[PDB]
Amino acid sequence: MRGSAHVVILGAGTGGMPAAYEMKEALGSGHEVTLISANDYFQFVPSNPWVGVGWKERDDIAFPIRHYVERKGIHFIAQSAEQIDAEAQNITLADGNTVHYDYLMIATGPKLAFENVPGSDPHEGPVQSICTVDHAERAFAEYQALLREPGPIVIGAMAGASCFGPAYEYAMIVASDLKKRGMRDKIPSFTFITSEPYIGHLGIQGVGDSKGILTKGLKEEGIEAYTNCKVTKVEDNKMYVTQVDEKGETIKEMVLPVKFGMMIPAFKGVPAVAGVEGLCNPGGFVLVDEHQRSKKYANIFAAGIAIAIPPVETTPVPTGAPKTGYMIESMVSAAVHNIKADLEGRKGEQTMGTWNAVCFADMGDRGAAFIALPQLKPRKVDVFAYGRWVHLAKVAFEKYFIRKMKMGVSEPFYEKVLFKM
Amino acid sequence: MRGSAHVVILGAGTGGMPAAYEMKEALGSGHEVTLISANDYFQFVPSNPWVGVGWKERDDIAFPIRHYVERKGIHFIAQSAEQIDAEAQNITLADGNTVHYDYLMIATGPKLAFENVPGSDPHEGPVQSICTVDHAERAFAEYQALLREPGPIVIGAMAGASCFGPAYEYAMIVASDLKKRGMRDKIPSFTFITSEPYIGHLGIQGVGDSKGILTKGLKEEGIEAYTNCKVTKVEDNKMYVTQVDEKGETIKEMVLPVKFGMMIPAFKGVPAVAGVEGLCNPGGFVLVDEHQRSKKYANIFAAGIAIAIPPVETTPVPTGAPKTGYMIESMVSAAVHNIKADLEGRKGEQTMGTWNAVCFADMGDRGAAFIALPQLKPRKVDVFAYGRWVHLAKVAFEKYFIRKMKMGVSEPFYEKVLFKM
Numbered sequence: 008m009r010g011s012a013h014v015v016i017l018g019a020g021t022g023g024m025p026a027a028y029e030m031k032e033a034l035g036s037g038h039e040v041t042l043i044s045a046n047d048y049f050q051f052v053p054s055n056p057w058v059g060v061g062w063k064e065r066d067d068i069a070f071p072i073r074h075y076v077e078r079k080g081i082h083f084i085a086q087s088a089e090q091i092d093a094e095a096q097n098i099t100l101a102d103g104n105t106v107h108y109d110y111l112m113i114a115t116g117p118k119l120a121f122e123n124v125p126g127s128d129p130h131e132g133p134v135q136s137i138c139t140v141d142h143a144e145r146a147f148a149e150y151q152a153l154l155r156e157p158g159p160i161v162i163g164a165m166a167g168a169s170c171f172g173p174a175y176e177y178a179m180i181v182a183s184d185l186k187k188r189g190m191r192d193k194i195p196s197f198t199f200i201t202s203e204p205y206i207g208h209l210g211i212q213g214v215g216d217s218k219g220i221l222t223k224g225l226k227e228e229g230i231e232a233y234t235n236c237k238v239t240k241v242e243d244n245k246m247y248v249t250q251v252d253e254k255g256e257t258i259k260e261m262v263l264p265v266k267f268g269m270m271i272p273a274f275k276g277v278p279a280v281a282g283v284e285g286l287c288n289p290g291g292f293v294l295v296d297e298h299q300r301s302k303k304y305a306n307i308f309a310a311g312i313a314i315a316i317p318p319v320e321t322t323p324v325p326t327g328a329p330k331t332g333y334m335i336e337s338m339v340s341a342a343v344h345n346i347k348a349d350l351e352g353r354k355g356e357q358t359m360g361t362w363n364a365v366c367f368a369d370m371g372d373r374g375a376a377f378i379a380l381p382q383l384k385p386r387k388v389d390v391f392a393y394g395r396w397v398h399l400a401k402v403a404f405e406k407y408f409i410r411k412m413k414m415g416v417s418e419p420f421y422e423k424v425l426f427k428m
Numbered sequence: 429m430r431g432s433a434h435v436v437i438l439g440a441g442t443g444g445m446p447a448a449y450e451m452k453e454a455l456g457s458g459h460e461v462t463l464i465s466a467n468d469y470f471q472f473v474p475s476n477p478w479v480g481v482g483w484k485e486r487d488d489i490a491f492p493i494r495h496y497v498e499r500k501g502i503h504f505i506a507q508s509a510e511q512i513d514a515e516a517q518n519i520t521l522a523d524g525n526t527v528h529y530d531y532l533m534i535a536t537g538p539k540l541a542f543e544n545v546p547g548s549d550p551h552e553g554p555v556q557s558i559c560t561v562d563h564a565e566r567a568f569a570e571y572q573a574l575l576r577e578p579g580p581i582v583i584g585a586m587a588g589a590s591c592f593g594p595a596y597e598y599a600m601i602v603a604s605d606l607k608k609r610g611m612r613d614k615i616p617s618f619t620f621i622t623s624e625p626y627i628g629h630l631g632i633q634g635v636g637d638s639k640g641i642l643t644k645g646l647k648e649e650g651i652e653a654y655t656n657c658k659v660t661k662v663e664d665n666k667m668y669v670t671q672v673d674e675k676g677e678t679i680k681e682m683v684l685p686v687k688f689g690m691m692i693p694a695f696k697g698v699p700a701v702a703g704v705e706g707l708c709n710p711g712g713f714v715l716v717d718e719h720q721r722s723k724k725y726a727n728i729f730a731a732g733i734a735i736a737i738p739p740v741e742t743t744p745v746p747t748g749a750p751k752t753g754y755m756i757e758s759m760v761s762a763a764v765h766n767i768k769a770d771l772e773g774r775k776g777e778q779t780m781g782t783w784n785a786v787c788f789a790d791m792g793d794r795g796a797a798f799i800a801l802p803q804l805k806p807r808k809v810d811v812f813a814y815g816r817w818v819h820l821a822k823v824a825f826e827k828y829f830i831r832k833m834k835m836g837v838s839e840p841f842y843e844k845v846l847f848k849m
């Protein structure tokens with residue numbers, strides 16, 4: 008309302024959850040902050056691959072949201088938004104109720120675009136997913152079924168995927184788990200299929216020696232790997248794969264039987280956001296300026312996977328660059344600061360800063376991590392590392408982030424750098 | 429003087445130069461800040477290996493100090509301290525003049541302990557050094573002489589050394605330069621000798637895959653490598669080497685002819701500081717608390733290589749852990765802050781923070797860098813990286829640090845992290 012702005016945060020995930028706390032903290036008692044999300048629980052998504060192999064359970068990585076945000080003065084609506092009218096500034100919820108906003112922060116993350124590959128939906132065939140805890144649990148269930156009746160394994164990433172790390176991570180831990188169960192030698196064939204132009208491209212043109220180390224890693228585990236691949240369909244428990252050359256021409260077609268499978272899908276924007284006229288690019292990603300503000304609607308901001316970031320390269324098979332946790336947090340901080348500024352006359356000048364990608368993958372006793380910035384080479388930092396410190400860091404961070412999501416966030420978030428001072 | 433403390437900084441190097449600026453800036457016009465150093469010029473020491481192979485010249489990496497510090501209100505005495513009387517708080521200079529202090533900040537760096545190995549002094553035989561620009565220039569001159577009359581090369585690190593990186597770096601660039609000159613195949617034998625327990629120990633129990641990558645690097649260049657070595661003497665242009673086992677017992681003795689050689693010597697504390705009774709450990713390193721304050725004299729502080737840091741491991745052949753630039757700067761900032769606090773009643777509580785080692789080595793088009801913290805494993809960060817970004821970073825940093833040393837430093841020094849924001 009006038010003089011008492013109502014700020015709505017859409018999506019309670021890695022960007023959205025902290026956004027709600029930061030917003031309330033920044034705006035104080037004289038402004039209404041409402042968090043709206045499809046699920047009533049928060050999930051720590053980097054843990055999903057471990058859930059998918061049964062190394063973690065849902066209870067460890069997920070918790071109900073209401074009490075934690077409400078104790079902080081935040082209103083929580085555990086309902087999916089179906090429609091957004093940017094003109095009337097109304098959001099229509101699943102149950103038909105409508106919510107008005109003065110400012111909207113879109114943090115809706117990815118739509119998992121299984122529709123890009125007929126039969127690839129986890130409910131349609133043997134190709135599973137580890138992007139959400141629901142799917143990772145389903146994946147593990149199917150993993151157990153492969154255990155009872157061994158058959159070929161196919162893990163990897165679809166055309167248009169932008170999140171490659173987890174495919175490598177899942178493939179490695181499955182292998183690990185298969186050995187630990189003394190079941191590894193029961194598998195007819197274990198294949199890695201990716202839209203990357205080469206192993207360890209990772210959607211970022213490689214980082215450190217990601218190419219050499221991931222290649223060696225896959226061979227070490229007896230996983231046969233194909234790059235420049237797109238899946239055209241999953242059908243009759245078979246994956247139809249087309250592999251191309253540098254110029255897009257076909258160099259082969261394969262038909263791979265699948266007993267157990269997991270392909271990272273392409274991400275698009277969620278329908279209710281992509282549905283807003285003139286808001287998004289053709290993929291359904293919100294077009295924002297450097298301040299995280301919609302280019303079309305001055306009172307709409309966005310952060311997280313939901314925003315559009317222009318491609319910097321064009322690969323034989325369509326691929327995307329990942330949007331990772333540290334950058335997402337910077338987007339969130341910028342949005343909160345700039346909205347607050349709006350509510351006070353100023354024009355917030357804060358931006359998300361330098362593009363970067365930071366990923367940590369835990370293999371059990373040790374992990375791999377990378378840091379790349381900025382997006383194009385030659386980079387200022389281009390590091391791929393492997394060791395125990397990586398495992399320790401992942402374990403530590405999951406514990407930290409989850410605690411933070413329960414206890415509240417002021418907050419210039421990452422002072423993980425107090426381990427220096 | 430009373431109410432107008434006179435602060436003296438001893439040594440104008442990596443810690444001392446910035447210390448003088450920071451001190452003056454922190455104390456202001458009502459306190460006298462005097463910088464005393466053996467040379468009238470500053471040198472950027474990480475560039476010395478390149479000078480030693482002729483890739484850099486003295487003019488690029490060194491400049492006279494006086495004008496830059498004096499324009500900032502700092503008094504500069506280009507004289508070596510010979511004696512320090514901590515009781516009367518008097519420093520005796522080479523020319524016999526004496527300087528009084530209320531506070532003393534010792535930043536004298538290492539004494540190069542060539543005396544540990546008879547005949548190993550750069551002026552005594554073929555074993556050269558790249559630790560100072562004087563020596564690196566001498567090293568290159570001798571390198572040219574090897575060029576005119578090819579013979580065996582021996583590069584490496586002495587027993588008790590603590591600075592291993594530069595030995596690897598020098599060995600690699602010599603190889604590189606030898607090839608570029610089409611002279612590589614003229615060398616009878618190219619040997620790497622180190623007191624490290626294994627290749628890439630680096631005095632820090634290895635970091636990332638330093639072991640594997642440096643091993644491969646040496647083999648790639650046709651350099652034969654021996655570890656667990658100590659040199660007993662250099663004589664008749666021969667290096668006498670004893671190699672031990674895990675328990676110190678001898679497993680062989682070698683006599684290596686040397687036409688061109690470069691061994692990193694052990695570091696001790698400089699004589700005028702080691703000469704202060706009860707100030708230092710047996711190596712001549714200043715015993716300080718976490719606030720950088722001498723454990724014996726409340727008005728004596730120290731930073732840089734000059735301080736003592738206890739060993740965390742004991743290697744078959746004596747070795748030390750390096751003290752590198754970022755940690756040295758933190759020591760400096762802490763000392764300045766705590767002295768200022770003293771001069772105002774408070775007890776400064778600032779410390780240098782977490783132990784760490786950060787090294788960058790440029791090979792020409794690309795480099796290797798590492799980051800390790802804290803000192804003991806398992807670490808929070810344990811990274812060894814190689815690439816163009818390393819070269820770019822080294823080149824950038826040398827340019828930055830040298831500019832900073834001419835223009836002044838407030839200053840919370842490293843905001844190299846504004847490349848994020």
Ligand SMILES: Cc1cc2nc3c(=O)[nH]c(=O)nc-3n(C[C@H](O)[C@H](O)[C@H](O)COP(=O)(O)OP(=O)(O)OC[C@H]3O[C@@H](n4cnc5c(N)ncnc54)[C@H](O)[C@@H]3O)c2cc1C
Nearest residue numbers: 018019020021022044045053087088115116311312331332
């Ligand atoms: C398997 C996997 C592993 C990953 N590992 C890492 C890692 O190790 N490090 C790293 O930095 N990044 C990692 N990421 C990348 C990234 O950081 C995550 O994808 C992260 O969760 C994205 O943050 P987000 O806020 O944009 O989207 P999300 O976390 O997916 O949150 C979006 C939210 O909004 C909701 N929503 C969607 N539509 C609606 C609607 N119409 N109405 C209401 N609510 C809606 C959702 O249900 C959800 O809660 C990983 C991603 C995946 C898939």
Ligand SMILES: Cc1cc2nc3c(=O)[nH]c(=O)nc-3n(C[C@H](O)[C@H](O)[C@H](O)COP(=O)(O)OP(=O)(O)OC[C@H]3O[C@@H](n4cnc5c(N)ncnc54)[C@H](O)[C@@H]3O)c2cc1C
Nearest residue numbers: 439440441442443465466474508509536537732733752753
């Ligand atoms: C070859 C080499 C390469 C290195 N490369 C790196 C790198 O890439 N990155 C990194 O972080 N570190 C590097 N280091 C390690 C380290 O950071 C340096 O050694 C650094 O210069 C040490 O800082 P300092 O202030 O303690 O000593 P110094 O820089 O040596 O300064 C000490 C000073 O005090 C003086 N002095 C000594 N005795 C007296 C006296 N009696 N009276 C008056 N003045 C005196 C000196 O002449 C000198 O100016 C390298 C070291 C070497 C030898």
Ligand SMILES: CCCCCCCCCCCCO[C@@H]1O[C@H](CO)[C@@H](O[C@H]2O[C@H](CO)[C@@H](O)[C@H](O)[C@H]2O)[C@H](O)[C@H]1O
Nearest residue numbers: 172175176179221224366367368375376377393636637
């Ligand atoms: C974070 C996103 C990236 C993708 C997700 C995960 C990908 C899967 C990991 C593959 C790595 C497997 O391969 C593994 O890597 C390194 C190779 O340098 C080796 O480890 C080697 O370097 C490390 C340090 O970095 C040393 O501590 C080690 O002693 C050395 O052998 C391992 O011996 C090898 O088994």
Ligand SMILES: CCCCCCCCCCCCO[C@@H]1O[C@H](CO)[C@@H](O[C@H]2O[C@H](CO)[C@@H](O)[C@H](O)[C@H]2O)[C@H](O)[C@H]1O
Nearest residue numbers: 215216593596597600642645787788789796797798814
């Ligand atoms: C900073 C202190 C450390 C010591 C100082 C300097 C030591 C000398 C450097 C030795 C490195 C030489 O060896 C070199 O290393 C890496 C090995 O992973 C290789 O490079 C490999 O990984 C890099 C990324 O990290 C990739 O970009 C590259 O395509 C790949 O081949 C080089 O092909 C090899 O030639």
Ligand SMILES: [Se]
Nearest residue numbers: 171172329366
């Ligand atoms: Se990733």
Ligand SMILES: [Se]
Nearest residue numbers: 331365366367
């Ligand atoms: Se990631």
Ligand SMILES: [Se]
Nearest residue numbers: 592593750787
């Ligand atoms: Se080093």
Ligand SMILES: [Se]
Nearest residue numbers: 752786787788
């Ligand atoms: Se270093």
